Design a protein around this ligand. Structure first.
Ligand code: MG
Ligand code: MG
Length: 382
C-alpha cells in the first residue's frame, strides 16, 4: 500500500508532510511525495521518493494573481495523476486552489483524499468566525468568495475528466473530516459541526548537534535572545537595540549575517543551518513572526516567546502564546524600541520562563505518528 503526499512547496507545508511520510513508512506502508524540485535534498535525507512538480521586477496586478491561481489548479490536474499511480490514498495541506485539484484527481482514481490544517481557527464552524446566523453567514461568504475565484476553473477541469461539478469549495477542499496537525494544548481545536480530528503537530526529532562555534558563543555568556525574521533591516536593528537594553546577546536567524549594526556587533551571532529544537532550549527567548511550526518548536523547547504576527495563522498563535502565559503577543507587525522592550520585560521574567518550561512538557511530539495510524486505518476501510 502506497500513500501519496502532495505539497505546494513552502517549508511550512513541506516539513509536516515529510514527518507524516516517515511515520507512515514506519508502519510498513510505502510513500511518495510530490513537491517542488528544491525539496529534492530534504526528501533525499529521509529517503522519501520525490516526484518534482510545480514551481519579480515589476508590481503584481489582478491579472498576475489570476494566472497564479489558474496555473496552481492546472498543475494538479496535469501532474498528480502520474504521481498517484499505484497509490491507495493522497494527503495534502495548504493552498485551497491546489487542494481542490488534488482531490479531484483522487476522486477520478477512486482513492481516498485527506486534508490537514496547521491552525484550528481555519476549520469552518458555526460557533466561531473565520480568520479576520451571523457566524454561519460569515463562513458562507468566504466560501462563496472561494467559489468565485476557483469554482469556474475547477469545474472546467472536472468537465475534462468526466467528474460532476463542485458547488461547495470549503467542504470539497477540506472534507468534512479534516485533521488538525497542531498540538491540543498550544492550539486547541474549538467546537465545530465538522468531524475534525486533532492529532498534534507533525514534526520529526532533530538530532543534529549545534556547531562548535555556536556552542562556544552560547557558553560565552548568559542565554541570548533568538531573533528570527523576511523583515526590513531597520526592524532588526531596533530589535537588537531592545535586546541589548535588556543585557542579552543576540542570535540572528539565517540571512542576517551581513546586517550593518550600530554599536559593536560582537554580541550578535548569525547562524546558518541549525537545529532549532536544540537551540531553542538554550536561549532566553525567541522572537519571531508566529508561524505554526516555529511556535510549536519553541513551545516544546520551553522557550519564552515574543510574536510579531504578519499574516495567516500568525495572529492566532500570537494570541495563544499570550493566553498560555509562555510569551507576548506584540501589537504591531513591526517593532519599535519601546514596544519590543516592553515585550522583553515580560518575556524575560522568571515567571514566564517557569511557565514556558512547564507547558513544554505537555506539548505532544507524536502527532505525525498519530496521523499515520489514523490514515492507515482509514485506508484499510476501503
Ligand atoms: Mg504544465
Ligand atoms: Mg462546465
Amino acid at each position: 500500500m502506497r500513500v501519496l503526499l502532495a505539497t505546494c512547496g513552502s517549508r511550512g507545508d513541506t516539513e509536516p508532510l515529510v514527518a507524516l511520510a516517515v511515520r507512515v513508512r514506519d508502519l510498513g506502508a510505502d510513500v511518495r511525495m510530490c513537491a517542488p524540485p528544491d525539496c529534492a535534498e530534504r526528501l533525499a535525507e529521509v529517503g522519501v521518493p520525490h516526484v518534482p512538480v510545480g514551481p519579480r521586477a515589476k508590481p503584481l496586478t489582478a491579472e498576475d494573481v489570476r494566472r497564479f491561481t489558474t496555473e496552481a489548479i492546472a498543475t494538479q490536474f496535469d501532474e498528480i495523476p502520474a504521481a498517484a499511480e499505484g497509490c491507495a490514498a493522497v494527503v495534502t495541506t495548504g493552498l485551497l486552489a491546489a487542494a481542490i485539484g488534488v482531490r479531484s484527481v483522487a476522486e477520478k482514481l477512486g482513492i481516498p483524499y485527506f486534508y490537514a490544517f496547521h491552525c484550528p481557527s481555519y476549520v469552518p464552524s458555526p460557533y466561531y468566525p473565520p480568520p479576520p446566523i451571523d457566524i454561519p453567514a460569515q463562513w458562507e461568504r468566504n466560501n462563496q468568495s472561494a467559489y468565485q475565484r476557483y469554482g469556474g476553473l475547477l469545474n472546467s477541469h472536472r468537465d475534462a475528466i468526466g467528474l460532476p461539478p463542485v458547488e461547495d469549495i470549503f467542504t470539497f477542499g477540506y472534507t468534512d473530516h479534516p485533521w488538525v496537525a497542531a498540538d491540543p494544548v498550544l492550539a486547541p481545536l474549538q467546537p465545530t459541526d465538522l468531524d475534525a480530528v486533532q492529532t498534534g503537530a507533525w514534526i520529526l526529532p532533530d538530532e543534529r548537534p549545534l556547531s562548535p562555534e555556536l556552542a562556544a558563543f552560547l557558553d560565552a555568556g548568559p542565554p541570548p535572545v533568538y531573533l528570527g525574521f523576511g523583515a526590513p533591516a531597520d526592524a532588526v536593528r531596533v530589535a537588537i537595540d531592545a535586546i541589548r537594553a535588556h543585557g542579552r546577546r543576540v542570535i540572528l536567524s539565517r540571512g542576517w549575517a551581513d546586517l550593518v549594526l550600530p554599536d559593536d556587533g560582537a554580541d550578535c551571532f548569525a547562524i546558518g543551518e541549525v537545529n532549532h529544537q536544540v537551540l531553542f532550549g538554550r536561549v532566553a527567548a525567541v522572537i519571531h513572526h508566529g508561524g505554526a511550526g516555529t511556535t510549536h518548536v519553541a513551545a516544546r523547547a520551553g522557550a519564552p516567546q515574543i510574536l510579531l504576527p504578519q499574516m495567516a495563522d500568525q495572529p492566532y498563535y500570537a494570541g495563544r502564546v499570550a493566553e498560555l502565559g509562555v510569551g507576548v503577543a506584540h501589537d504591531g507587525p513591526i517593532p519599535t524600541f519601546d514596544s519590543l522592550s516592553a515585550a522583553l520585560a515580560t518575556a524575560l521574567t522568571p515567571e514566564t520562563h517557569a511557565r514556558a518550561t512547564a507547558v513544554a512538557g505537555t506539548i505532544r511530539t507524536d502527532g505525525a505518528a498519530v496521523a499515520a495510524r489514523l490514515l492507515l486505518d482509514a485506508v484499510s476501510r476501503e
